[PDB]
């Protein structure tokens, strides 16, 4: 989210994320007003369940074209540069970046494909640069008549309106597999209290009772203690041993 330059929309980046703790709340501090559309999952309930892998795709698109990055949509960017599957679960975060990706002379480093033989399958990349023969005459690589280069440039300028200003877009995709979930968010904690009848939670283990200092000596790997009657009676504090 704090990278200096984002990849072009046609050659959109692909980042894999696994075995990490993700705090999505920070993503609410990007801009005072920004779109946070999420598909198949409520954003406020992203800190409890967790997934096996996360896919992040980042690029820059024109402001009025941001509506095409959604399942079931169509247009120019939707089928020629980046296609989203209909059975998609995840989130899209797009915010204005006019102060970082604008040149008075004009930004030409951002490119997008304009011509293609067919549409794009979901999650597909086309980085070809072959000339497009619009007509029937094969021009064999000269931009004459009925032969146009597939790529065009987003000539970004700060004097443009909001409908043409650049917008940075990051798409997060989640999924469920048989592999154990590993990308799980923070779980927080609370200060301990001793010698009083309280309700306690220890690593998902519920309980209610009085916590006292214990003379028992677990093995280093031991976590819980059970009595003769097969009930939990000794616990190891996850933070301090």
């Amino acid at each position: 989210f704090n990278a200096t330059r984002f990849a072009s929309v046609y050659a959109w980046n692909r980042k894999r994320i696994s075995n990490c703790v993700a705090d999505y709340s920070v993503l609410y501090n990007l801009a005072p007003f920004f779109t946070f559309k999420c598909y198949g999952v409520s954003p406020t309930k992203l800190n409890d369940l967790c997934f096996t892998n996360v896919y992040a795709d980042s690029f820059v698109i024109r402001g009025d074209e941001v509506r095409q990055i959604a399942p079931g949509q169509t247009g120019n960017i939707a089928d020629y540069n980046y296609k989203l599957p209909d059975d998609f679960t995840g989130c899209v975060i797009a915010w204005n970046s006019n102060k970082l990706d604008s040149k008075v002379s004009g930004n030409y480093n951002y490119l997008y494909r304009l011509f293609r033989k067919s549409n794009l399958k979901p999650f597909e990349r086309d980085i070809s640069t072959e000339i497009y023969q619009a007509g029937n005459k094969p021009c064999n690589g000269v931009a004459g008549f009925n032969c146009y280069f597939p790529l065009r440039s987003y000539s970004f300028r700060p004097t443009y309106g909001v409908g043409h200003q650049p917008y940075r877009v990051v798409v997060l995709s989640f999924e469920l597999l048989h592999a154990p979930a590993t990308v799980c968010g923070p779980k927080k904690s609370t200060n301990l209290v001793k010698n009083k009848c309280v309700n306690f939670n220890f690593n998902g283990l519920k309980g209610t009772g009085v916590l006292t200092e214990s003379n028992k000596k677990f093995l280093p790997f031991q976590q819980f203690g059970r009595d003769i009657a097969d009930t939990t009676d000794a616990v190891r504090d996850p933070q301090t041993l």
């Epitope: 200096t4 330059r5 102060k99 970082l100 604008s102 040149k103 008075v104 030409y108 640069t129 280069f149």
Partner: antibody, heavy 121, light 108 residues
């Protein structure tokens, strides 16, 4: 990675046009942008022009309208700049520079060895 | 056009020293700036573009810092190969101007 070769030293009378070549070798050619810079012996550097051959945009410095034109050939994979109506204060080392799409067109990633160009009588 | 100045014009530093060079534009140029070093008689080489991004192959010791109209390049531990002429280059709006060129030398 990418190697740049420029022409040789050029000595001429003021009243003619001079053509300077710049050959770049390495990687895909269509992703490169070509920039031309001056360096007078008695002062620093000064930019003249930038060309994007795949998109066809040429942009020259304000004091160089009508005097310099920059083009490129994809078959030879080279860039050329021609400067006409030379004056005595135009003698300098000419530098060819390359910018990459992955990165920036405006910045100069690789530099040539330069060509010394002098005009006198 | 954008007129910018690099300061100080002349600096004397030594091996292992920590040095900085300031570079200020006339009006706002956002954060579009590049820095180049030149050996005497050799070709220029890029070090930092966007005023924060460090070009691959250049030692990580060089550090750029700036937001707009004011930029600095900092060197932590100087080496004898660091003596060169330093030029700025802004590429916001056309007519890309260069700097005066700071030459860094030893104390005799």
């Amino acid at each position: 990675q990418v190697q740049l070769v420029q022409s040789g030293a050029e000595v001429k009378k003021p009243g003619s046009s001079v053509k300077v070549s710049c050959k770049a070798s390495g990687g895909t050619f269509s992703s490169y942008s070509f920039i031309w810079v001056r360096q007078a012996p008695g002062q620093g550097l000064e930019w003249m022009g930038r060309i994007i051959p795949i998109l066809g945009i040429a942009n020259y410095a304000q004091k160089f309208q009508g005097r310099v034109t920059i083009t490129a050939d994809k078959s030879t994979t080279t860039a050329y700049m021609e400067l006409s109506s030379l004056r005595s204060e135009d003698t300098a080392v000419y530098y060819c520079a390359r910018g990459t799409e992955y990165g920036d067109y405006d910045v100069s990633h690789d530099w040539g060895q330069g060509t010394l160009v002098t005009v006198s009588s | 056009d954008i007129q910018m100045t690099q300061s100080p014009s002349t600096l004397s530093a030594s091996v292992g020293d920590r040095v900085t060079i300031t570079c200020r534009a006339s009006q706002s140029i956002s954060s579009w700036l590049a820095w180049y070093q030149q050996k005497p008689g050799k070709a220029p080489k890029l070090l930092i573009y966007k005023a924060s991004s460090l070009e691959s192959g250049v030692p990580s010791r060089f550090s750029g810092s700036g937001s707009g109209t004011e930029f600095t390049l900092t060197i932590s531990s100087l080496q004898p190969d660091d003596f060169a002429t330093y030029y700025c280059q802004q590429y916001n709006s056309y007519s890309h101007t260069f700097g005066q060129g700071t030459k860094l030398e030893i104390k005799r």
